[PDB]
Amino acid sequence: METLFSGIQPSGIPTIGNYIGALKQFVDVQNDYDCYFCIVDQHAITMPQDRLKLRKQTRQLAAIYLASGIDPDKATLFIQSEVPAHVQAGWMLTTIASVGELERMTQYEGIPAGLLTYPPLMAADIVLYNTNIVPVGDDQKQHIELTRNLVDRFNSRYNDVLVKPEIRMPKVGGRVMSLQDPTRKMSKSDDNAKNFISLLDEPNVAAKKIKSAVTDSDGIIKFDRDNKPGITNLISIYAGLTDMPIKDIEAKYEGEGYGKFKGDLAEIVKAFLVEFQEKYESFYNSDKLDDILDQGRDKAHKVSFKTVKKMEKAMGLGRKR
Amino acid sequence: METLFSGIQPSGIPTIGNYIGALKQFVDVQNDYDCYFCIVDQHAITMPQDRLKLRKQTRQLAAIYLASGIDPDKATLFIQSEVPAHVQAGWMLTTIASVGELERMTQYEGIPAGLLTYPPLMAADIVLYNTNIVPVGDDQKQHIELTRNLVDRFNSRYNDVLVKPEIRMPKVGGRVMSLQDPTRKMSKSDDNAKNFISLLDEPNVAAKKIKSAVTDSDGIIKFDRDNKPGITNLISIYAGLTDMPIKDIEAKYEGEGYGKFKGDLAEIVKAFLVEFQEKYESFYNSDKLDDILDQGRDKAHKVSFKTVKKMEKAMGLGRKR
Numbered sequence A, B: 001m002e003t004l005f006s007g008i009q010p011s012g013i014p015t016i017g018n019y020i021g022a023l024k025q026f027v028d029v030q031n032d033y034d035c036y037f038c039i040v041d042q043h044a045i046t047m048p049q050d051r052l053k054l055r056k057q058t059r060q061l062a063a064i065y066l067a068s069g070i071d072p073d074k075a076t077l078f079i080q081s082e083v084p085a086h087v088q089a090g091w092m093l094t095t096i097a098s099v100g101e102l103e104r105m106t107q108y109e110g111i112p113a114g115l116l117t118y119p120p121l122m123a124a125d126i127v128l129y130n131t132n133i134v135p136v137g138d139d140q141k142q143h144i145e146l147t148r149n150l151v152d153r154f155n156s157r158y159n160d161v162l163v164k165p166e167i168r169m170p171k172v173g174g175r176v177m178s179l180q181d182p183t184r185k186m187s188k189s190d191d192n193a194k195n196f197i198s199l200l201d202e203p204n205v206a207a208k209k210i211k212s213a214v215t216d217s218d219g220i221i222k223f224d225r226d227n228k229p230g231i232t233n234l235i236s237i238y239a240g241l242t243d244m245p246i247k248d249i250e251a252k253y254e255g256e257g258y259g260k261f262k263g264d265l266a267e268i269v270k271a272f273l274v275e276f277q278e279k280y281e282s283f284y285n286s287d288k289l290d291d292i293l294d295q296g297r298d299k300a301h302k303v304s305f306k307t308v309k310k311m312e313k314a315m316g317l318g319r320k321r
């Protein structure tokens, strides 16, 4: 069985685009892959953070993943700073990186040193768990390339300890675009709040954003990205939250206009968010949340401990006991 | 009671100059100060290391400190990599340093990244234990200045957690010079082996280096650095290993020439090394050594754990449990 590792930034609420694109797919592939979902608070502080905002956001991300159906027995969901192996192996890999290498990553009071030196900590996050695949995109290519090069350098200079990972998302979900800029991907940090639907938007506010989505005044319910990216995007959201095949949405709305379709979807979005937020609140306001994250932390520690110890032996750190 | 923290590089055997200058003084001040002696293997690998040489050298340093009289109940003697707090707090401080700051420290395949980013790990080594004094010299001034500036930055941006340290050696020992270059300090890594006496030199080889020390052919046994740095250096070694006051060495050899004095000192050096190496071998070949270092590690962990947790709370890492 292949191991998958995904890092999660506690710096913002996922959108429904993030839920359709990735999160809902993870609920399925956690049966077929050995999955690690790591809330990376030690990467978050490379950027300026309000310390209270950060602890709140960490809890929120954990409750959002659990509300999505990430199962803490099938998968390992944990907070990066609670597993010491990450900074232990982050330091080991830093000593074999070069400064020039790191400065080139930057390109692709003064500048915080964390922004130069986090990539080896990212590499450590991944290799500690013998990861085979990482579900990321184009703008992480150079980071995974550094990871693979560090694994080669470590295995070459010391001895075979670490495994090289690959960029692969096992089941690609739909791509959801900005609701009022259909050519741009949806983002949680848009200056135009009408562009995205947050998983924690009020369910009434979300249905309004479906209605305010930028489209023609009327038309056919047909999937056609190049000519009608507005209605097509909404069709993608419809498919993403109902699992109804696209051709079957088309035939269902044959002879219907935009008003009927957008009314129906605004209601689907409202219902999805009502059910989702009920689960989110119960996890987020529960005492079991801390129990869940404790067990996640212990699962990760047991695996990454063995990897760290093999690295230390290969570099001559510590003692032979 | 003030806390003292000293870092020890496992990269070479201390000389008798290091024993007279510092180590023998630590055997006394460990009664009056709360002392930490940390073998910094995670700093050693910022430079290229043979991994077997490194694990051997770590054990050797620990046995040399114990053979000197560093008492594991009075003081805390431990290996840096066995206490996770050091890289945990090293990462926290790195995020508040600036790149420019770090590059300026450097000045005072390509260049290993560890050489740029170790100073915040040095700062962490010190502040984890609420250290008041560090027994270092001129070439560490900029490192302690960075440490003090980081403590100010952390306390200012988050809240009061950390303590600022000062450069202070409580009881300065004699300064021992190179035996065949009396104007230069003695160093374990001289290309001229006759310049230094290693604590693990064969006791017969050491007495020969006393005889080959560069001095006048004859003279008075008088302490006079500016005119007779050769004989004066040997007088300093005599005082350092016998504790006999210098004026009392002078009166003892009144009316004696160099031959009698150098004969006597070569025998004193030989005897000191015979007794010292017997203790060193028994610690180094013993199973209790691992027990000693285990207890040292547990002592340090209990103290630095509380500091790390206070830092994490102040930055918003982790959870409130």
Ligand SMILES: CC1(C)c2c[nH]c3cccc(c23)S[C@H]1C(=O)O
Pocket: A005, A006, A007, A008, A009, A040, A043, A121, A122, A125, A126, A134, A136, A140
């Ligand atoms: C910073 C980030 C969240 C991260 C830290 N550690 C990782 C391990 C695997 C995948 C990723 C990460 S994604 C990456 C990103 O830039 O989005």
Ligand SMILES: CC1(C)c2c[nH]c3cccc(c23)S[C@H]1C(=O)O
Pocket: B005, B006, B007, B008, B009, B040, B043, B121, B122, B125, B126, B134, B136, B140
């Ligand atoms: C690298 C070194 C051995 C070190 C690491 N961490 C420290 C904490 C206090 C004092 C020191 C150190 S001395 C310092 C040196 O350059 O000699």
